[PDB]
């Protein structure tokens, strides 16, 4: 039963892109001491063809 049981990037970073038709699918932006990076926010299931990640 449900009851018995690197940092995230600045949201404005993606928000300024998002309001301008930038779309990121299945990935999230993370920041570390080395710098920015893109990481899969979930499990990307391998499909028949290439999958769209960002636009």
């Amino acid at each position: 039963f449900p009851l018995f049981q690197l940092e995230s990037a600045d949201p404005d970073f993606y928000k300024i892109g998002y309001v301008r038709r930038v779309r990121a699918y299945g990935v999230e932006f993370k920041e570390g001491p080395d710098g920015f990076g893109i990481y899969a926010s979930k499990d990307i299931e391998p499909r028949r063809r290439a999958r769209v990640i960002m636009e």
Binding site: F1, P2, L3, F4
Partner: protein, 301 residues
């Protein structure tokens, strides 16, 4: 005595099959008259049922477009005359009547042998005229219905001929009250007052289902008994009761936690188990001490 009254301000019987009535209803709050008027008009024009002949059986007729020797009117004219007979009845079902006369003479609506549950509105309604003494036997079918539809007869069941209403300002804008008038025209099968009362009752029966219990609320006349039968069956081959049928009332919780769960729309044990700790933490007056004590209480169960 009543602050809001209704009365018949005019009643008129223009003919045997055309009654008139005007009714008043004041004082009404602003906007109530429009709702009452539109709902009452739609109920009068669509929700009131009537009785009429729907099927007539002949014996020696090739088709409904033929003549009979000795009767001035053809079969089609006889059927058209039969379609105009206005009847009244409070019961449902396909009753049957009989026309069994010998000529010559005039066949009026008082020549129909009716079952005790059906009455004739107009005795003088014409069906056919017999010029010579020929036998004539017609078997009829009568049922009560709404709207409109052995030779079939296109029966129009609506007994209200027309309706109208008007809304007038009561006066000074203390509460901006209103006056409602309703005009009803019927065919004599029921008076305009009877039509008004029947429309009110039909509207209430149309709106009252929403005040029942929601579909799939009790376990499936007396909703208690099926659940008792379920409990009896569960007593044999002991399998206990499902968590959905067990409520948080029967679990010993502190009153604050009980109220917290209740206003969060948590009622049954299955809902409690489906809930997560984070969501309960999101709800105020519910600290980690409450979480752990509730978990201990559930573990004790």
């Amino acid at each position: 005595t009543r602050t809001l009254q209704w009365k018949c301000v005019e009643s008129r019987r223009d003919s045997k099959r055309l009654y008139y009535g005007r009714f008043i209803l004041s004082p009404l709050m602003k906007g109530q008259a429009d709702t009452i008027g539109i709902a009452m008009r739609r109920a009068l024009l669509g929700e009131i049922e009537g009785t009429c002949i729907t099927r007539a059986k002949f014996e020696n007729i090739p088709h409904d477009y033929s003549n009979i020797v000795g009767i001035q009117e053809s079969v089609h004219e006889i059927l058209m005359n039969l379609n105009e007979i206005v009847l009244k009845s409070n019961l449902y079902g396909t009753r049957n009547a009989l026309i069994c006369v010998q000529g010559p003479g005039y066949i009026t609506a008082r020549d129909i042998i009716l079952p005790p549950s059906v009455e004739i509105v107009d005795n003088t309604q014409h069906i056919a005229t017999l010029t010579e003494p020929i036998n004539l036997c017609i078997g009829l079918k009568i049922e009560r219905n709404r709207g409109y539809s052995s030779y079939p007869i296109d029966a129009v069941f609506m007994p209200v001929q027309n309706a109208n209403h008007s809304i007038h300002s009561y006066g000074n804008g203390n509460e901006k009250q209103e006056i409602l008038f309703i005009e009803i025209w019927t065919n004599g099968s029921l008076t305009p007052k009877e039509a008004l009362h029947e429309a009110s009752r039909n509207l209430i029966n149309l709106f009252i289902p929403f005040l029942h219990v929601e579909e799939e609320t009790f376990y499936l006349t007396l909703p208690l008994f099926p659940f008792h039968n379920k409990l009896v069956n569960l007593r044999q081959k002991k399998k206990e009761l499902a968590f959905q049928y067990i409520f948080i009332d029967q679990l010993e919780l502190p009153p604050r936690i009980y109220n917290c769960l209740k206003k969060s729309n948590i009622h049954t044990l299955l809902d409690l188990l489906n809930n997560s700790q984070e969501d309960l933490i999101k709800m105020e007056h519910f600290h980690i001490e409450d979480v752990k004590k509730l978990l201990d209480i559930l573990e004790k169960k």
